[PDB]
Amino acid sequence: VHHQKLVFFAEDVGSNKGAIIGLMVGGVVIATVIVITLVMLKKKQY
């Protein structure tokens, strides 16, 4: 099975400062991705 992350550039519909609100609400999936990674990276030891 392949992927399709070409929709990642869809955020261009936004603008600038006001895009913070879009990136914040849409940032829920990116949060869990980076956060899950942070578990294994365990920042500053335990």
Query: DSSP string of 1-46?
Result: ----GGGGGGGGGS-STTHHHHHHHTTHHHHHHHHHHHHHH-SS--
Binding-site residue set: 2-3
Binding-site residue set for Cu(2+): 2-3
Residues sharing a CB contact under 8 Å with residue 44, sequence separation 6 or more, in sequence order: none
Side-chain-side CA neighbours of 14 within 13 Å: the count stands at: 15
Experimental determination technique? NMR
Give yes or no for a contact between 19 and 11, defined as CB atoms under 8 angstroms apart.
Answer: yes
Binding-site residue set for Zn(2+): 2-3
Domain boundaries, the chain: 1-46
